[PDB]
Every structure is written in structure tokens, then in C-alpha cells.
Amino acid sequence: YLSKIEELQLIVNDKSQNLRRLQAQRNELNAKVRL
Amino acid sequence: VSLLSESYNPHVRYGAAMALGICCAGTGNKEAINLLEPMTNDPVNYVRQGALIASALIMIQQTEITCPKVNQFRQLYSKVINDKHDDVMAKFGAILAQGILDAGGHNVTISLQSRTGHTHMPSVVGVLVFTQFWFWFPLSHFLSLAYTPTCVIGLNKDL
Amino acid sequence: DLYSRYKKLQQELEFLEVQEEYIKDEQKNLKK
Amino acid sequence: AVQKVVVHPLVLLSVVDHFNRIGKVGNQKRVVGVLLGSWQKKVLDVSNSFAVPFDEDDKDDSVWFLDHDYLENMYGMFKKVNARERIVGWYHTGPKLHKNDIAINELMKRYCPNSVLVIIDVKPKDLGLPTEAYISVEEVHDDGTPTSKTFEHVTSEIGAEEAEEVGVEHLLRDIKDTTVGTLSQRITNQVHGLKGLNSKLLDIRSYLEKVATGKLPINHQIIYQLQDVFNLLPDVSLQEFVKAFYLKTNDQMVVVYLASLIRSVVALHNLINNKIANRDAEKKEG
Amino acid sequence: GIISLLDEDEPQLKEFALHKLNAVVNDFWAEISESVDKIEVLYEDEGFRSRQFAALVASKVFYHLGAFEESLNYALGAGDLFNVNDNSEYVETIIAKCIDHYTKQCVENADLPEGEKKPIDQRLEGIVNKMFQRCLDDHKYKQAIGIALETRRLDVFEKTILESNDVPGMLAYSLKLCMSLMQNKQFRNKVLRVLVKIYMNLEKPDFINVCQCLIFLDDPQAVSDILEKLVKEDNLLMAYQICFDLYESASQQFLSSVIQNLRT
Amino acid sequence: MSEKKQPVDEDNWDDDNVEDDFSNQLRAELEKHGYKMETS
Amino acid sequence: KLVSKSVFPEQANNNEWARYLYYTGRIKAIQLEYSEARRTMTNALRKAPQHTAVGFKQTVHKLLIVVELLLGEIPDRLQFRQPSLKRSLMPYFLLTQAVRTGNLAKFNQVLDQFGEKFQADGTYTLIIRLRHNVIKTGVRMISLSYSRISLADIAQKLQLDSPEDAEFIVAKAIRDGVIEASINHEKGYVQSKEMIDIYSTREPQLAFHQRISFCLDIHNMSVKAMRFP
């Protein structure tokens, strides 16, 4: 029960998948604008 | 490396396909095939054989029950060698993709990281020096030590 | 499973730190 | 009366491969050569030149070698390719001078209305300017001596004439045209602040070393004369620019009114269609 | 106005105010929060013998005020009744942060060569060697090896490989799995050399441990010694792992060194 | 709580109240309140 | 909250933050505050969500502008007035009627008339400073009007009957800082000034630092608003 705390609290921090989802989308966007 | 497929340039389109190859060799990935299928849909010829050779590197060690795109490419590479007016820089390594496609006849495989826990470094030497064989044709010949048997041998006495 | 429950999400944290840094650089190239 | 010339780095790259000659022919350290070109105006262009096999004794420094096999018939070649591109002057490296330079100028002032000596730079690390011109001058003194001939600091520049960047700007392979307001201004801040105020440290080398060991040009004729220009605004405590502060209300007047109203317009720019395309992308995703 | 009823400088009226503290502190979390300096006066006074309690409700109102490093400082000053509790909101969180400070302290001092450490203050280690005993007596030593991971230190690690009844194989996959989360070569070879010996300390000799430390700790002298065991114990049929993983997974330079050292 | 029939349904204010307090009054009325002086 | 001010979430519910800031508006209101209190009355008032709940803004807004009743500068809420609230603001319409009228018998006559509804208000800090608000409204109006008025002019018009308490009104008006009115000090008889030609040019673009630094705050609220999809 000791360190059963923080890893789901790091799964809280998977908004970087969402913010960097927008950044990955944007990479595709302007990358293919360039292409 | 799917994000690395976004590259503007054919050395990182092509080398990104190489990253699919030497990174995911013995894996049973279908998404790598899903990446390589537009990589042979590309007016650069040698990135299309980036898909030939790299997809031959995903089609090592594995059969049709592993992924359904095996026989598709087994017939598809002879299919694109039926097109005479392709580049023979495109079908440069097509027969090579058949040889990597049937290295052993799926009897042997790669050992980048052996099952023992430790890597198998002369296989790593063979794959890393293997790469840019346009620049030196015997770089193609250097893929000797990169293969280990996928077989079963019950030895108690050596004869 | 607190042996490696704790460790493994950091391995999948560093890399998106690097591309999180890096998308600004590529967009900075696409300005060029 | 020369402000500037146009410098093609082509024959400067011939100073580069003659800088490759001197590293392998022997004892000759400095790259000395002869500058071709044509006086069109106070502004000039240099399109070609040539680098002379030259030797210079360290004892009695005025020993020149400008061979006329190397001069005349090569001027027949350089005349034969183009009647336009004839001589205009000559060059050598090092920053300051050469005890022979003046004489080397007078060997070719018979060839040119103004043979210019442009002292050149093979290894640029400078705080000021690149290669710079020195015109024929007779300033002498208020004395009435025989005529001085040492060729004084007559400003020049590196001008760029024509297209020529099919090579050059293909060979950039690194650089970006900054839309100024994108750090290029602080690059200029480092170069004029730093590279100006270390030149100010050269000016305390002047106005300390000349106080220390400096003879007759300690206060020849320009030190107090440009202590006037130093006496634009050097004053003591805070210099008390009392006109300049409500004059500065007339200044910052403009910048803050434009930033205020105009950046509220920028608030429309960013804010409004940021929200529209935002929530289209947001709830139209469902 | 319950702290202005403390102008008497004897601790015996602080006992009666403390009497109020065990009752209505939650209604008075405003009221206690201005009292903090006098609580500091209660902690600085050594004649105030209830200074343990001053650090208790100090870390209560700092726990409420969101001070946590100072809830750590007066969590340390709280005394011995600190660790023994089983509260699910306050004490397990502040020992989660206290032992978070202990494990980042053991990472910091694990990176600090030859002592010069921040010392174990006098109220540490309590639920370490208490809840650790709950996990030993759970007979699930994954926690007990968990602390040994958390300290990067082979003191509780040596006791949890000389530990009680369970399969030795708990260590064995951990032999790979410490290889999984391994960061440095610094205690990789240390754990890697002490598990192969705790298997030799164990009665049953392991064969996968030297199959691993030949290809991760690469000692051509211990395999000469247990190769003299293989001449001695004479069973070549159990000898396959080290002989032909030695032929299989060893480096060619290490093959040269191992044929140098092994024929002796 | 909107649970009824209904879901179909100082500047100059404090001075609109005093200015609506003297509504027929003589707040101004110059020629009236100013020249009642010399009429008699 | 004066010591544990940690009252700041993402303010997700967007009505919780509104009526919450209203509630601490009542808190700072009842402690002692005019400006911050009335501007979070203003901020919670402009964050009042819709007209989708009747009465719950109406009674809470009967309680919202009470500090503005204590400013002296308050308009009469008739467009806020629900006609169902009209029968309940019958003291309250007449209360702000008693506010803007300078009468004293009316001032104690409305309190006398509806002290029970003022108990339903339960906020009798209104009446301890509301007579004070009468004299501050009078001195604000007349001090705003005339540059050099006499204290006898304002005094025996507003029934002050003596010069020295008028000097105390001028004294605590300087202390409260409304006007820079001095006294031609013999026996009273204020010599004073208005304040124009004060300044008008740099001082606005001083404020434009906060206007447009506030604007760039809202700019990055739009960039972080762009971070959502």
C-alpha cells in the first residue's frame, strides 16, 4: 500500500499524450504543408 | 519511428524505414507493415526498396499466421519485378528482399539481443556494417554472423 | 507490483520530453 | 573622398588560395597582393585582383618585390580578358601596416588616378570592420615640411554587387532570413554594445597609453577636436536631460499608444478566431 | 482566543490548552495558524516537556496549512508515538513523504561517496523496521525487496536475500528484472556479484546465476573454480548451461580470457 | 430552482428615483420659482 | 482564509467560482471593505450565469449591492427588480430612496419602518455607517461641485449648526482623502480648490500597462484555450 499511490498519479500526467497529441497532429500538419 | 516517417527527406524516409527494419526485426508488428505500405508508395525508388528490404526484415522468422501480409509481399515482390519498367534501383534489392524473406527458409534468424540475456555482438556488427551497400557492394556480403538456428537439438552424447 | 510499477512510466516519459522539446524546433524549420 | 567599395569575395578566395600558397612556399608569412578594379564613383567595385610573389626584409623593411614579368604581361592577360578590369590598388594582410607599404603604393600610382591600399584580413576575428580602404592623401601638417604621403583611413565596406548566390546562398546551408524582432536585434546588441565598448576600451588604451607613453599624436589635431564630439553628452551625475523626459513623454507617447490600441487589436486577432477555430476543432470533433 | 489563555509560562497550562487541542483543533484551524510562532516557542523550549506534542499539532496545522517540509521537520520532532499509528489520512501520508524523503535521501547519499551524509534523525526508521516487518510477516518479500530497491544500499538488501521462507526464484527473475530497471554500472555489478554468492550461501547451487554473471559480470576466474567443481562433481549433464552458454553468449575477447584462465 | 410555469418567460438611477419622486414638482422652473420675487 | 488562502482551483464549475467569490465578497464586506468588496460584488455579479433560476440572483443581489448602498454612489435597481421581488423590495426601494435623500427623519423613519426586514437582512453594519454615508455623500457632491465653498455654506445647509464639527468633517475628509480642501484658518470658512489640470497624458498610458498586460494575460488564456482539442 506504500507506493501504490504515484503511478496512477503519473497516469494523470498523460495529458502530454493529449497536448503532444496536438503537437503530433501539428507536426503532421505543417510537415505535410511543407511536403 | 512512425512519427519519424513524417520526414521530408529520402535519407530519413529511407533511414526511418531502416529504423523500422533493424529496430523491429523479429517482432510480429503489423503496424510496421502499415507504415511501409505507403513507403513503397513513394516516387523515390530506394525508399520503395526501403519497404522491400525493411519489410523483408519484418518478414524474417515469421509465417502467414503471424501476420496476413506475408504472402502478399512474397507474391508482391515478384509482382513488382514483373513490371519491367520499374527502376532497377527500385528492384535493386528486390531479389535481396526475397533472400532476406527466406534467410534459412525461416530456419535461422537475427540475434541482436540473444535469449541468454546478453546481446550477440558479431550479428550486431553484421547488421550495422551491412547498411549502406551502395557506397560499398561488399557491405551487402557482410551479413554472415547475423543468423542463429530456430531448431531443436537433443544432445546427450555428441554423436 | 511495486517492484517495477514505479519505474516503467519514467521510461515512457523521457522520450516525449525530448520530442515535446523538439516539435518547436521542427516548426521552427518549417518557418524557414 | 571614398566612402565605400563593392567587394567580390571571389578574388578574396584567391587571397584564400594564395593564403594556401604562402603556407607551403616557405618563409613568407603575410599575403600581399595587387588589387584590380575600376573607379566609377566614390563607390567602387572590385571584381578581380592578383596576389604577388613578394618578399620583405625584416631589416630595412622597405624592400619590395613586384615583378614586372608578373606585372606587365599579366596585365596584358588581365587586359586581354577584359579592358574594364584594370588595376585600382593593392593589398596585404595584418591589421596595421608595413614600413614598405607607402612606397609600394607609389609604384602603381603611375598606373592609377588613385591607387588604393586595402589592408586585408585572412583570419577574421575582428571587433570592427572587414578590409578597409586608404586613399592617396597629402595632409602634411600646419608646419610646411615636405609633403606627407602616408595613406589615411578613408572608409570602405564589403559591398555586394549582383546575383552570384546560385553558388553563395546555396552554400549557406545553415542560415535563416530573420524577420527582425526575432533575436537579430540582440545579436546587434551584443556586437554594438560589446564590440563598441571594447573599442571604447581601445579608446582608454588611447587616452591612457597616450597619457602614459604617447608622444606627438597625443594631441596632434583631433583629440580635443573630437573631445567636442565626446562633449555631445558625457556629463557627471546623470547628465540631466530634462528636455528629453517630457520629450520622452512625446516619445513613449507613441509606442505605448500604438502598443495599447494596436495590441488590443491583436487581442481581437489572436483571441477571436482562436476561440472560433478552437471550439470548432473541439466540439466539432464529436 | 485559546492561545492568549497561555500567559502562564508553566507547561501545565499548555497541557490544558493541549487538552483543547485534542478536541477542537479542526474548528480552530484558523485559530492555531496564528499561534505558530508560540508553537515555535513550545518547540524551542526544552523545559516544555510536551514539545513532542508541539511538533504533533505543529505538523497537524502545517499538514492543514500545506507545509510539508516543516510537517517533515516537526514530523521528526513528534517522537515515538508517530510511527506506531495506522491512520489512513494523516500519518501514512506524512510517513509516505517522510520515507519519500528517506529514499531520496538514500539516493542522494547513494550518490554521495564516503559518508558526509545527512544523518538519520532520531525518529526515522520506525515504520521502516515496522511495516517492513508487516511485509516480512506477509511472506511477500516484494515489498521487502522494494525497500532494498528504494535505498540503493546492500544492508536491508543483504537481509532480504538472506531472508526467510519463500522461493529463491523470487530473486532469480529479479536477477533479470534488476537488469530491467538498471541505471548504473555502480551497483549493477554489486547486486550482480552478491546474488550469485547468496545462491552459493544458499545450499542449492544455482546455475543460471553464473550463466548471467558470465555475460554481465564476466569473471573468468569463478567459472574456472566452479569448472573445477564440474571436474569434481563430474556431472556434465547439469553442466550444459555454463559450458555452452559460455560457448554461446560470451565475447570472443572474453572467450580468449576464459580459455586462458579456465585451463588452469 | 426553476420549477414553475415560467420557462416560457450612481449613473442616473438613484436619481431616476428622486427624479421620479418629484415627478410633477418644481425642480427647475426658472420663470416661475425665480420671478415670483418682483411680481409683488 | 486570511492565513490559509488556498482557494484557487481551475474553477471548473464556473458557477461555484461565481457564487463562491460572492460569498467571500460577503466575508470581506462584513469584515470591513468597500473597494475590493464591491468589485467582487461586481465580478461575481458579472459572473452570474443566466436568468435560468428566478429569485436566486434576485435576493442574492438584494444582498449584493449593500456595500454599494454604503458607498453613497448607488443607482436604484428597478431593471434588476423582478415584480415578484418588488413586493419584497418595498423596504428596499424605499431604503435607497432614504439613501439618496439627505433627510434624517426619513433616515430613521425607514429604519423605524422596516427594522424587521433589516433583521431579515441581518447586516446592521449598514446603519452604523449609513448616517456616515449620508455625510460622505453630501461632502462628496458639494466638495465635488465647488472649488472654494465655505464650511458655513455646507454646514448650516446640511444642519451642522457650528463651524468646528464642520472642521472635523473637513478634517476627516482630508483623512479619508476626497478633496484637498484646506481652511482659511481663523474661525472656519474653508479656502479650498477643486482639482483639474491635474494630469491626463502619461497617467493613462501608465494604466495601459495593466490594460494591455491584462490583455496579454487574456492572450495566453487563448493560447491555453487552444491547448484543449
Side-chain angles (χ1 to χ4, degrees):
Chain A
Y1 292 101
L2 190 145
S3 68
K4 291 181 183 178
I5 303 173
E6 301 171 353
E7 293 298 313
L8 298 169
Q9 291 174 352
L10 202 156
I11 296 168
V12 177
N13 305 120
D14 295 335
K15 296 298 292 180
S16 301
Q17 184 181 2
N18 303 114
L19 295 172
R20 285 188 70 254
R21 178 70 55 83
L22 284 173
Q23 296 177 358
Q25 288 175 358
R26 182 176 296 169
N27 189 8
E28 183 179 3
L29 287 171
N30 298 317
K32 292 178 181 179
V33 166
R34 180 256 176 88
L35 290 172
Chain B
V1 183
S2 176
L3 187 62
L4 298 174
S5 66
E6 296 289 325
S7 59
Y8 64 96
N9 42 4
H11 298 80
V12 184
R13 286 192 296 265
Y14 174 66
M18 297 183 75
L20 273 81
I22 66 174
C23 190
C24 297
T27 69
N29 195 6
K30 186 179 183 293
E31 188 177 1
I33 296 166
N34 197 4
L35 290 175
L36 289 168
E37 182 65 33
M39 300 307 286
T40 184
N41 196 2
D42 197 355
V44 170
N45 42 4
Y46 58 90
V47 74
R48 296 194 296 268
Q49 69 176 350
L52 299 177
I53 297 166
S55 177
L57 292 172
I58 198 65
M59 288 186 293
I60 61 170
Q61 197 177 2
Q62 292 176 354
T63 62
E64 185 67 22
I65 198 167
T66 66
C67 61
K69 301 297 186 292
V70 174
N71 292 321
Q72 299 297 319
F73 294 159
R74 294 183 65 88
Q75 69 188 356
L76 192 146
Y77 297 169
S78 297
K79 179 66 176 178
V80 301
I81 207 157
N82 294 127
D83 193 1
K84 184 178 179 181
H85 297 289
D86 289 334
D87 288 330
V88 197
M89 185 167 292
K91 59 177 70 174
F92 194 71
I95 176 64
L96 186 143
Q98 297 300 109
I100 301 302
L101 176 61
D102 292 329
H106 293 89
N107 293 323
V108 294
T109 182
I110 51 96
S111 64
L112 273 74
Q113 185 63 33
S114 68
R115 188 174 175 84
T116 69
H118 185 66
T119 185
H120 184 271
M121 63 180 72
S123 175
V124 181
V125 168
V127 67
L128 73 92
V129 185
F130 180 71
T131 59
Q132 289 297 312
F133 61 93
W134 293 275
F135 299 159
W136 185 254
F137 288 157
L139 299 187
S140 64
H141 288 88
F142 289 159
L143 202 61
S144 63
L145 290 168
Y147 293 101
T148 56
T150 62
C151 68
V152 284
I153 305 155
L155 200 71
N156 52 0
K157 185 178 69 65
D158 54 352
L159 191 144
Chain C
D1 291 331
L2 301 181
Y3 186 86
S4 66
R5 180 64 60 198
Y6 186 75
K7 184 68 179 294
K8 291 173 68 176
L9 292 184
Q10 299 177 356
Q11 301 172 357
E12 288 180 351
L13 190 143
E14 300 179 353
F15 293 157
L16 57 149
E17 289 173 349
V18 187
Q19 300 98 28
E20 194 272 331
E21 182 185 1
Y22 179 58
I23 297 304
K24 299 289 186 179
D25 295 330
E26 285 296 319
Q27 184 181 1
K28 190 260 189 296
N29 194 6
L30 298 176
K31 295 179 175 66
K32 297 189 174 70
Chain D
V2 177
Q3 185 179 3
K4 60 186 178 296
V5 303
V6 175
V7 175
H8 286 285
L10 287 74
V11 79
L12 182 147
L13 201 153
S14 177
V15 182
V16 175
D17 72 352
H18 189 270
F19 183 76
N20 196 9
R21 301 293 177 85
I22 54 97
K24 64 186 178 180
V25 296
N27 291 320
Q28 183 62 38
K29 190 272 306 296
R30 65 178 64 86
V31 180
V32 185
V34 182
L35 187 73
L36 298 169
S38 176
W39 178 265
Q40 186 62 41
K41 194 56 67 179
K42 173 171 68 64
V43 61
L44 185 146
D45 190 359
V46 174
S47 299
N48 200 357
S49 297
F50 56 99
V52 56
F54 178 77
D55 280 329
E56 191 270 333
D57 285 322
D58 53 351
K59 187 185 266 79
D60 193 4
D61 290 328
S62 64
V63 176
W64 59 267
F65 291 99
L66 303 173
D67 196 4
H68 293 87
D69 190 6
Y70 187 77
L71 197 151
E72 299 289 329
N73 300 116
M74 182 176 278
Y75 188 74
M77 285 187 173
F78 289 169
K79 184 59 68 180
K80 187 174 75 174
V81 53
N82 190 4
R84 177 66 63 191
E85 186 71 25
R86 67 186 182 275
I87 38 85
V88 73
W90 64 275
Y91 60 90
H92 70 284
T93 187
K96 183 63 72 175
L97 37 106
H98 300 291
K99 77 153 202 141
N100 198 4
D101 184 1
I102 174 170
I104 302 168
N105 196 350
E106 297 296 323
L107 191 145
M108 61 181 71
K109 193 168 290 300
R110 63 184 178 177
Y111 294 113
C112 186
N114 42 2
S115 299
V116 64
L117 59 95
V118 178
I119 309 174
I120 50 95
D121 190 3
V122 294
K123 296 178 288 291
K125 296 176 290 295
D126 290 337
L127 76 157
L129 201 149
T131 73
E132 188 266 333
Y134 293 92
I135 211 62
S136 176
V137 290
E138 292 84 5
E139 65 286 24
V140 205
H141 204 265
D142 203 0
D143 220 8
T145 61
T147 300
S148 179
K149 195 180 288 294
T150 302
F151 301 95
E152 292 294 327
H153 183 279
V154 195
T155 166
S156 175
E157 74 180 3
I158 308 300
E161 187 197 3
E162 285 299 324
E164 79 189 4
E165 287 165 351
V166 169
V168 171
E169 285 179 353
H170 183 72
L171 284 165
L172 295 174
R173 298 334 120 231
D174 186 74
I175 203 65
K176 180 187 183 294
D177 183 75
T178 64
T179 62
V180 177
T182 150
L183 141 78
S184 174
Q185 64 278 15
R186 65 95 53 85
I187 295 165
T188 65
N189 284 122
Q190 292 180 356
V191 180
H192 71 259
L194 193 146
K195 300 295 191 293
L197 290 166
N198 59 6
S199 177
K200 186 64 71 179
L201 190 144
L202 268 60
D203 298 328
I204 206 162
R205 176 62 65 195
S206 77
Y207 292 159
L208 181 60
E209 194 273 334
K210 293 293 182 177
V211 181
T213 59
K215 291 184 71 67
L216 296 169
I218 177 172
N219 197 13
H220 182 62
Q221 93 314 355
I222 204 63
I223 305 302
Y224 68 101
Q225 189 177 2
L226 219 141
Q227 193 177 5
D228 193 355
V229 195
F230 181 76
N231 203 0
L232 263 67
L233 46 99
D235 293 337
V236 275
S237 67
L238 294 172
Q239 304 190 358
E240 293 179 354
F241 288 165
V242 181
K243 304 291 186 290
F245 303 127
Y246 63 94
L247 184 153
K248 185 70 175 178
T249 306
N250 193 10
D251 300 341
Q252 200 66 252
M253 185 78 186
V254 176
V255 170
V256 183
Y257 286 164
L258 292 174
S260 62
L261 283 77
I262 275 84
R263 288 295 190 267
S264 64
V265 179
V266 174
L268 179 130
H269 277 94
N270 286 318
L271 282 170
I272 300 304
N273 287 318
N274 197 354
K275 291 177 180 67
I276 291 172
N278 192 8
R279 292 174 293 174
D280 289 330
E282 191 271 333
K283 81 178 293 185
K284 295 300 290 183
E285 187 175 1
Chain E
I2 66 103
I3 310 103
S4 63
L5 303 173
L6 293 176
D7 292 332
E8 185 178 5
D9 297 327
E10 277 79 3
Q12 53 189 352
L13 187 61
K14 305 284 187 287
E15 289 173 353
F16 299 143
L18 50 117
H19 294 83
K20 293 169 73 174
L21 284 173
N22 50 7
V24 288
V25 59
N26 49 11
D27 188 75
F28 287 162
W29 274 340
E31 183 67 30
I32 303 306
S33 309
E34 299 91 7
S35 177
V36 167
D37 52 350
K38 290 181 70 68
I39 305 300
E40 299 296 325
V41 175
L42 290 176
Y43 186 77
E44 292 296 325
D45 192 74
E46 296 177 353
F48 178 65
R49 299 177 64 190
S50 299
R51 58 177 294 168
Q52 292 85 16
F53 192 84
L56 260 74
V57 292
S59 291
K60 293 289 291 298
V61 75
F62 293 159
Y63 180 77
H64 170 257
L65 262 62
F68 294 110
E69 294 87 3
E70 191 61 36
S71 299
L72 176 60
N73 292 124
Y74 290 155
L76 291 179
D80 188 76
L81 60 96
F82 185 77
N83 285 314
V84 72
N85 294 317
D86 54 351
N87 193 4
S88 178
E89 288 86 4
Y90 171 67
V91 71
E92 71 177 5
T93 56
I94 63 174
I95 69 179
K97 294 185 261 76
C98 180
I99 295 301
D100 194 7
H101 179 74
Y102 181 75
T103 186
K104 73 182 181 67
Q105 187 62 43
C106 292
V107 169
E108 190 270 331
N109 296 125
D111 297 329
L112 182 59
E114 199 269 325
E116 62 188 358
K117 300 181 293 297
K118 300 297 183 290
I120 289 172
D121 292 332
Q122 299 302 111
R123 278 82 60 194
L124 271 69
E125 187 61 28
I127 56 103
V128 179
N129 61 15
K130 181 171 74 69
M131 191 60 71
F132 179 79
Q133 295 297 322
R134 301 289 182 87
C135 297
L136 294 181
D137 298 330
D138 201 7
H139 294 89
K140 179 57 65 67
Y141 302 99
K142 292 182 181 180
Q143 294 300 109
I145 205 68
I147 290 99
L149 266 65
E150 292 297 326
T151 185
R152 281 86 170 89
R153 187 177 297 115
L154 280 76
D155 51 351
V156 67
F157 179 76
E158 183 66 31
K159 193 174 76 68
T160 52
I161 63 175
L162 196 63
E163 69 185 7
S164 176
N165 143 54
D166 207 303
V167 61
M170 288 185 69
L171 284 70
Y173 64 85
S174 185
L175 284 172
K176 183 178 73 175
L177 283 187
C178 294
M179 189 66 213
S180 174
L181 54 89
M182 188 54 66
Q183 186 57 255
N184 51 5
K185 307 293 185 294
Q186 183 60 256
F187 64 94
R188 183 185 67 86
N189 52 359
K190 291 179 179 175
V191 173
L192 181 63
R193 75 185 287 276
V194 77
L195 295 185
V196 302
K197 294 178 177 66
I198 204 68
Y199 290 158
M200 293 299 108
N201 292 319
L202 198 144
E203 190 270 330
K204 296 297 290 182
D206 192 2
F207 289 156
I208 196 165
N209 53 355
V210 65
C211 180
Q212 181 169 356
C213 78
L214 188 139
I215 62 176
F216 289 101
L217 190 69
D218 65 5
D219 294 330
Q221 70 278 14
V223 63
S224 67
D225 297 331
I226 68 169
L227 183 138
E228 189 175 359
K229 293 178 182 179
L230 295 178
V231 181
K232 180 67 175 65
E233 191 268 332
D234 205 9
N235 195 1
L236 297 167
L237 192 147
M238 61 169 68
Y240 181 78
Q241 296 301 110
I242 190 63
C243 289
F244 290 93
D245 184 73
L246 174 60
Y247 184 69
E248 182 181 3
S249 181
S251 177
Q252 181 68 42
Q253 184 175 2
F254 182 73
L255 285 176
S256 179
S257 70
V258 84
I259 193 163
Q260 182 179 1
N261 296 118
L262 255 55
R263 68 174 177 269
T264 301
Chain F
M1 297 297 106
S2 179
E3 190 176 2
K4 60 176 72 66
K5 188 178 68 66
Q6 75 187 359
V8 179
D9 296 331
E10 55 197 4
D11 294 330
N12 184 264
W13 291 95
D14 184 1
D15 196 12
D16 199 5
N17 194 0
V18 182
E19 185 268 334
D20 281 329
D21 187 75
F22 296 157
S23 296
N24 49 2
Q25 231 203 325
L26 8 55
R27 317 314 329 316
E29 240 153 345
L30 295 174
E31 71 319 300
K32 182 177 180 294
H33 182 62
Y35 290 168
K36 282 179 289 191
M37 295 179 183
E38 68 270 19
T39 45
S40 293
Chain G
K1 295 174 263 73
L2 298 179
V3 299
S4 301
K5 185 61 72 181
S6 179
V7 304
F8 296 96
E10 195 268 330
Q11 61 93 28
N13 296 115
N14 203 3
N15 193 9
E16 193 276 328
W17 188 256
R19 67 179 171 86
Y20 171 66
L21 264 63
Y22 181 76
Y23 292 142
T24 183
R26 189 187 289 109
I27 296 302
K28 300 178 290 292
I30 198 168
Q31 294 299 110
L32 189 146
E33 180 64 31
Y34 290 163
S35 174
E36 183 178 1
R38 71 186 171 86
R39 72 182 171 87
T40 185
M41 289 303 176
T42 308
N43 194 2
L45 178 59
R46 68 183 174 92
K47 202 181 168 66
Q50 288 177 358
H51 57 285
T52 187
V54 72
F56 290 99
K57 185 179 178 176
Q58 294 298 108
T59 310
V60 98
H61 184 68
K62 179 179 285 184
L63 191 54
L64 190 145
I65 50 98
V66 184
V67 289
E68 299 180 357
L69 290 165
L70 294 174
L71 292 173
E73 47 180 357
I74 181 157
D76 190 2
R77 51 184 296 273
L78 57 94
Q79 80 197 358
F80 293 102
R81 176 186 57 82
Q82 189 69 252
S84 294
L85 190 71
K86 175 179 73 69
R87 291 179 182 177
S88 67
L89 60 84
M90 293 298 292
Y92 191 69
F93 181 82
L94 191 63
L95 178 60
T96 184
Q97 178 63 258
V99 169
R100 181 179 180 274
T101 54
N103 190 5
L104 281 74
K106 183 69 172 174
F107 174 74
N108 292 320
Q109 188 175 2
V110 174
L111 176 70
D112 182 72
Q113 187 62 42
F114 299 114
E116 295 292 323
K117 182 62 179 176
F118 295 153
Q119 287 171 357
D121 296 330
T123 172
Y124 283 93
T125 62
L126 58 92
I127 198 69
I128 194 68
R129 65 174 69 96
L130 215 154
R131 183 177 178 86
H132 185 77
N133 195 14
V134 171
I135 195 63
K136 290 296 180 180
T137 303
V139 76
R140 183 181 298 114
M141 180 179 176
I142 301 168
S143 74
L144 189 143
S145 182
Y146 293 103
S147 165
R148 186 179 176 276
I149 201 66
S150 171
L151 51 83
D153 298 334
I154 184 169
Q156 284 79 18
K157 178 176 68 176
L158 293 178
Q159 296 177 356
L160 275 74
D161 203 9
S162 67
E164 70 275 13
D165 58 348
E167 293 170 353
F168 288 162
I169 292 298
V170 175
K172 294 180 182 180
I174 294 166
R175 179 64 62 190
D176 289 329
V178 178
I179 198 67
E180 78 331 288
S182 181
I183 292 97
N184 198 0
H185 287 91
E186 180 68 28
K187 303 276 104 172
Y189 294 160
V190 164
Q191 69 188 355
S192 62
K193 59 176 66 61
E194 291 291 329
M195 44 182 288
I196 54 171
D197 197 2
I198 181 72
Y199 194 59
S200 63
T201 300
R202 167 67 60 196
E203 181 64 35
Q205 55 190 350
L206 295 178
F208 291 166
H209 296 91
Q210 289 84 21
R211 301 291 182 89
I212 310 298
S213 71
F214 179 66
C215 284
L216 66 90
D217 298 334
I218 304 166
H219 275 277
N220 293 317
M221 292 304 108
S222 64
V223 180
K224 296 305 291 179
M226 191 181 177
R227 295 297 180 273
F228 284 112

